[PDB]
């Protein structure tokens, strides 16, 4: 209930900040600026998308890394610990793949 | 079953229904499958839990991995197929017939 | 076409997770390790032909233990019997599941 | 499933020790030798597909072909015959635990037996 | 509660078998007030 | 010799690459070539999370320690000193 | 308060008609981040601390954060509600309706079967009486993974360089 | 099935160790030493009866060899006890290591007056054998009688009757 | 793609096969499904086309969908049973749901549609893979689940899959398309039995699977994908075109070539059920099948179409590339039947 009530403060108080900064100053009359947004009329370039994808596998591979610290406390420390490399060994292998071939444009 | 489990699979067939019913962008159709993988990493880890299904709490991390790469894999199919037409839409993948 | 070379070759691949009566990290106990040790042992090497029908009472306890849905039944019809014997008035709850008297220890 | 999940069945086995007991299929089987004919075959098919003589080039290629197909044959039916041995092998092991299931019906005469005669006219 | 409940046997366990089964948090704190059943459920959950 | 001058170059160009490479070596050699991996294993099994749950004396059970704190059973002294 | 997991619950399925009803992506991402964050919720409420903070760091946090990225540089489409065009927001009531009334089915009637068999009582009843001690069930088995899971491990990361490799493949034109 | 066998509350009613947890974990390692006969015989019974309907006495025991053991420590080292709680008790974690001089205090006068003796790192963690007179439990888990198994093998193989008697092949 | 990098992709696909095939853990079976997809797509997509980008994004949705419903049936048995091991389901619902999706991931009618699509889309090669290979891992998991499959259920979609892959191919003219649906139609023939006896199904899954390998080599040898291109291969190669005759006989299942063993087998064991209407059908429904085998047949070799002045060119070149194997797969895809009584080897 405790976290719960930091996370229901924290947002009204964001939101009750929106509101006096959203609707309350634009209740002072400034005139009108009869300005229209003039509009007259795409870069989907992979240089983005690339950063994109390779971000969420290393991110997976991360989450995968996350349960080494109590992981270090078992018995069959050996095997532990070779699977822990072998997960950054592939981290590794696969970011030298992107380095090595046509990669890292980003 | 009690009743958060039964709103857990229907959150995973509501998820399907929409997931199977396109309407114009394939990338609401990816937005469904990967919610369906978040139901069903929920589902999973309930009933790991309260089992007390120790050795099998590394299930839902797995399931959430494999999940997230078909989705990177959609994704890369999505844009190739965005780049080639100009829109994501599944009109557009209609060269293949029958 | 079950290949089954982990048997072949003696190796567990995936065998450590398919049960919870197996051996779990710091011997951390299933909720329903004897249900499901009990329905295991009397279903071995007996077949799932004969398992079906010869161990049906171990599984069903399992099943059971796993889903409480029979044990969420009684309780239910005890909570619905409780809540209209309240509406007429011919049942009180007593001060120590009201709470007044302190729990033990 | 039948006899895939029979017990004592060592996993991914082709030959258990106890087809030994059965006799080895002899090398001039019928079964064998159309092993090898259709060795030859494929030997004269490659030769075809590859525009060489088909009838001649390629003595060692065809030879092969024959030769690897009589030694997997040899073997293919050494387990054949394992398995249908296994089949009459437990067949009757059945019977003989199950008496009941498998009674002998009393064997009478056609003198005794009335069969219902159907002229045909 | 339910004495007057036809065919009630009270305490009937929902097990075949005879073997203890440690209770579930309904089997002791159903009846009791929801203040306690919040504690014996959440408490550790949400104390933090 | 060849392999020398390659280093040299690697260190002179992409410095940091080659310390990663070095790093990561290490860590990979040295915990096979160190005698605490050995207590680093013990002093996992050591730590006792779960209830050293007794068994019952039937007479021929020597080593086993049927008493508080003597003699038989299992010692930490070797993590006192560490 | 004690049932706030069904309340929860339901909340989940309501964000799942949200986004299930195909709306703009950019709300729809929205009604994929409300539920997910609300199943982190629920998975917190059953205790899988790990678990939870899993989903809202990488399904939440990167898995949906890489979907919304792809939304916004191809962005050909015109922004509308869950209570837009009406092939999204009959969609959308229809799913809350639905949902409704399993609900009411659920809390009224106490045994609910429509293809399962469900029963009304609090999700608390579930929960088992019990001690970890100084443990964290969760937390060990799933680093019980490096120990006794070495097979899913080699499995899992081979996966992932293949998934590295097939991307670049694919996205190489 | 069955009606649960429970027992009456009368026969469950124990004078209960009303003491604070901080005040148990400063005596903890002298109560596990002093106590370590009735509180071992109790882990075993509930480890083999697998019941807690059937080691109730046992555990009326270990609480009172509980209290014994912490009235010796009021009329002996009271004083010396309640500066070593107190200092446990003010850490969140009841950390040991922040009331050090105040066990040496405890330990000391334990040791002079009781005679106890702290036990070290690593002993209370020890399996320790039990001669208990309680019949090892034939069934523990009640199970029912295991299925009998299916015939198994047979005598030698010989030769298919007449081969593959498969339609028409003859071999 | 480079060659190594294709390697590796082909052996990825091979050992999520395996790994289903060789798993005791349902999660495994399903990480095995998951990286054959993962392994499956650039391989589809290794020449680099929009038809080709097309076929892709249709198989990954559909297969995709299938896992996803997969992995619900998984989780639903694990609540209802508490069991990992790929036995017996012990849910109905469960099991449903697994049976849709494996027959998804197959491609039985009525989730057949991806199939003649995503093959027209991808290569002969693309093609040959997914109508042989990809076929292994859902018919194992099928064949591990036959006890708790509903009878009732697969049959229907087995002689639905046998109707509507004749029916398809009778329209076809694209190579490719024809060999989707007949694929089909196997799959139905393959999976109608798979409640009986699974055996059967293994040995009509071997025998198709020497068919399909046989017949997609000989397209490509040809490199033809219309019914035209394939009629212009008697002027430069007839022997190939003969064999393609001789393989599509077999797969209408014509005696005594190979194609009448499983035909026959499941014939044999469907009537030892006491089902005699619904093999009847099958087969009645196969001479369609045979129908549009024999239209091929006609165009490719029983008859001559018209051909090119360049083909005068082309005879003068010789094929360079060598498929070892060609030889062996038509010699036991055409001549086999004198050989059931090996079907023992299979049990």
């Known amino acids: 209930m405790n976290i719960m009530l930091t996370l229901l403060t924290n947002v009204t108080l964001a939101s009750l900040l929106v509101l006096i900064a959203f609707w309350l100053p634009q209740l002072n009359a400034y005139s009108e600026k009869t300005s229209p947004y003039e509009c007259g009329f795409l870069p989907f370039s992979m240089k983005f998308f690339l950063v994109a994808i390779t971000f969420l596998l290393f991110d997976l591979e991360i989450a995968l890394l996350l349960p080494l610290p109590w992981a270090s406390q078992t018995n069959n420390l050996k095997t532990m610990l070779t699977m822990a490399l072998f997960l950054l060994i592939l981290l590794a292998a696969s970011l030298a793949y992107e380095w090595t071939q046509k990669g890292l444009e980003w | 079953m009690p009743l958060v489990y039964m709103n857990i699979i229907m959150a995973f067939a509501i998820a399907l229904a929409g997931l199977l019913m396109y309407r114009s962008h394939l990338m609401s159709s990816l937005l469904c499958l990967e919610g369906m993988m978040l139901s069903l990493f929920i589902m999973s880890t309930l009933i790991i839990l309260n089992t007390h299904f120790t050795l099998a709490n590394m299930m839902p991390i797995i399931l959430l991995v494999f999940a997230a790469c078909e989705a990177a894999l959609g994704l890369s199919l999505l844009v190739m197929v965005s780049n080639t037409y100009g829109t994501d839409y599944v009109q557009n993948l209609n060269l293949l017939q029958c | 076409p079950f290949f089954d070379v982990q048997k072949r070759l003696g190796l567990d691949l995936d065998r450590w997770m398919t049960i919870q009566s197996a051996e779990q990290p710091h011997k951390i106990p299933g909720r329903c390790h004897a249900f499901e040790k009990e329905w295991i042992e009397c279903a071995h090497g007996i077949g799932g032909i004969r398992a079906e029908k010869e161990c049906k009472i171990e599984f069903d306890d399992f099943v059971e233990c796993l889903l409480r849905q029979k044990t969420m039944k009684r309780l239910s019809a005890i909570k619905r019997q409780r809540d209209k014997l309240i509406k007429e008035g011919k049942y009180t709850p007593p001060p120590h599941h009201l709470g007044k008297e302190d729990p033990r220890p | ?121 | 509660i339910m004495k007057d409940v036809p065919d009630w046997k009270v305490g009937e366990s929902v097990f075949h078998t005879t073997r203890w089964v440690t209770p579930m948090m309904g089997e002791l704190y159903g009846l009791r007030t929801n203040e306690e059943i919040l504690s014996a459920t959440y408490g550790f959950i949400w104390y933090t | 010799g060849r392999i020398a001058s390659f280093l040299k170059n690697a260190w002179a160009k992409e410095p940091v690459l080659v310390a990663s490479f070095a790093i990561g070596g290490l860590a990979i050699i040295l915990p096979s070539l160190s005698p605490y991996t050995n207590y680093a294993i013990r002093i996992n099994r050591a730590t006792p999370y779960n209830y050293p749950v007794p068994l019952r004396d039937d007479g021929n059970m020597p080593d086993v320690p049927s008493h508080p704190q003597d003699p038989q059973g299992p010692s930490l002294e070797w993590l006192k000193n560490l | 308060t004690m049932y706030i997991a069904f309340i929860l619950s339901t909340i989940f399925v309501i964000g799942f008609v949200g986004f299930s009803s195909k709306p703009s992506p950019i709300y729809g991402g929205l009604g994929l981040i409300v539920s997910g964050g609300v199943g982190c919720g629920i998975v917190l409420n059953f205790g899988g601390s790990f678990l939870g903070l899993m989903v809202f760091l990488i399904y939440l946090g990167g898995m949906l954060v890489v979907f919304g990225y792809t939304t916004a540089m191809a962005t050909e489409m015109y922004p509308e509600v869950w209570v837009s065009n009406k092939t999204v927001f009959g969609a959308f009531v229809s799913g809350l309706m639905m949902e409704f009334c399993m609900v009411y089915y659920a809390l009224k009637e106490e045994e609910v079967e429509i293809i399962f068999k469900f029963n009304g009582l609090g999700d608390w009843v579930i929960y088992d009486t019990g001690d970890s001690g100084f443990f964290s069930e969760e937390a060990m088995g799933i680093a019980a993974l490096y120990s006794y899971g070495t097979w899913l491990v080699i499995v899992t990361g081979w996966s992932l360089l293949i998934g590295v490799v097939v991307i670049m493949e694919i996205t190489r034109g | 099935p069955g009606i649960v066998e429970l027992p009456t509350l009368e026969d469950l009613k124990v004078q209960e160790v009303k003491v604070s947890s901080s005040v148990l974990k400063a005596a903890a390692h002298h109560y596990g030493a002093q106590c370590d006969k009735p509180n071992k015989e109790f882990m075993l019974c509930r480890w083999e009866e697998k019941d807690p309907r059937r080691c109730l006495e046992e555990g009326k025991l270990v609480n009172q060899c509980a209290l014994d053991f912490f009235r010796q420590i009021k009329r002996h080292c009271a004083e010396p006890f309640t500066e070593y709680w107190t200092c446990i008790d003010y850490s969140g974690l009841q950390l040991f290591r922040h009331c050090r001089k105040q066990q040496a205090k405890f330990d000391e006068c334990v040791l002079d007056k009781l005679g106890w003796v702290r036990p070290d790192l690593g002993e209370l963690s020890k399996v320790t054998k039990v001669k208990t007179d309680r019949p090892l439990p034939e069934n523990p888990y009640h199970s029912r009688a295991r299925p009998e198994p299916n015939p198994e093998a047979e005598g030698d193989l010989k030769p298919a009757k007449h081969g593959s008697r498969l339609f028409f092949w003859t071999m | 793609m480079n060659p190594i990098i294709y390697t590796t992709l082909i052996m990825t696909v091979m050992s999520g096969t395996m790994l289903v095939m060789i798993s005791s853990h349902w999660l495994l079976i399903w990480i095995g499904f998951e990286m054959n997809l993962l392994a499956m797509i650039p391989v589809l997509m290794k020449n680099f086309n929009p038809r080709a980008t097309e076929a892709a994004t249709k198989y990954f949705l559909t297969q995709a969908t299938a896992s996803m419903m997969l992995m619900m049936a998984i989780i639903i048995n694990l609540l209802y049973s508490g069991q990992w091991t790929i036995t017996k389901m012990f849910n109905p619902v469960a099991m449903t749901m697994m049976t849709m999706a494996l027959a998804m991931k197959l491609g039985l009618s009525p989730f057949h549609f991806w199939v003649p699509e995503v093959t027209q889309g991808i290569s002969l090669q693309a093609g040959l893979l997914l109508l042989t290979w990809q076929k292994l891992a859902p018919l194992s998991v099928l064949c591990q689940i036959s006890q708790s499959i509903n009878p009732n259920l697969m049959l229907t979609m087995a002689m639905l899959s046998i109707l509507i892959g004749g029916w398809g191919g009778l329209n076809q003219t694209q190579l490719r398309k024809i060999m989707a649906y007949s694929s089909i139609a196997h799959m139905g023939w393959m999976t109608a039995v798979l409640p009986y006896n699974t055996t059967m199904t293994i040995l009509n899954l071997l025998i198709y699977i020497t068919m399909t390998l046989a017949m997609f080599m000989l397209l490509i040898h040809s490199s033809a994908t219309t019914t035209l291109s394939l009629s212009h291969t008697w002027n430069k190669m007839p022997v190939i075109t003969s064999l393609m005759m001789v393989t599509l006989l077999s797969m209408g299942g014509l005696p005594p070539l190979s194609g009448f063993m499983p035909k026959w087998m499941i014939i044999q064991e469907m009537t030892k059920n006491e089902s005699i209407i619904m093999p009847t059908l099958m087969a009645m429904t196969a001479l369609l099948n045979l129908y549009f085998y024999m239209r091929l047949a006609y165009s490719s070799s029983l008859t001559m179409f018209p051909s090119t002045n360049n083909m005068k060119m082309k005879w003068q070149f010789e094929h360079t590339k060598q498929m070892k194997l060609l030889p062996t797969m038509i010699v036991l895809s055409t001549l086999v039947l004198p050989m059931t009584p090996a079907l023992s080897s299979l049990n």
Do not use: W
């Not at chain 4, 019928?30 to 494929?42: A, D, H, K």
């Open chain 4, 1 to 121: 499933t039948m006899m895939s999940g029979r017990p004592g069945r060592v996993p991914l086995q082709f030959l258990p020790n106890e087809a030994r007991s059965l006799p080895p299929p002899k090398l001039t089987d019928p079964r064998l030798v159309y092993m090898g004919f259709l060795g030859y075959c494929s030997g004269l098919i490659d030769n075809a597909i590859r525009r060489r003589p088909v009838v001649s080039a390629g003595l060692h290629r065809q030879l092969l072909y024959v030769t690897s197909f009589v030694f997997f044959g040899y073997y293919l039916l050494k387990r054949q015959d394992y398995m249908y041995a296994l089949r009459d092998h437990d067949m009757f092991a059945y019977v003989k635990s199950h008496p009941e299931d498998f009674p002998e019906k009393d064997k009478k005469t056609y003198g005794e037996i009335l069969e219902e005669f159907h002229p045909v006219r």
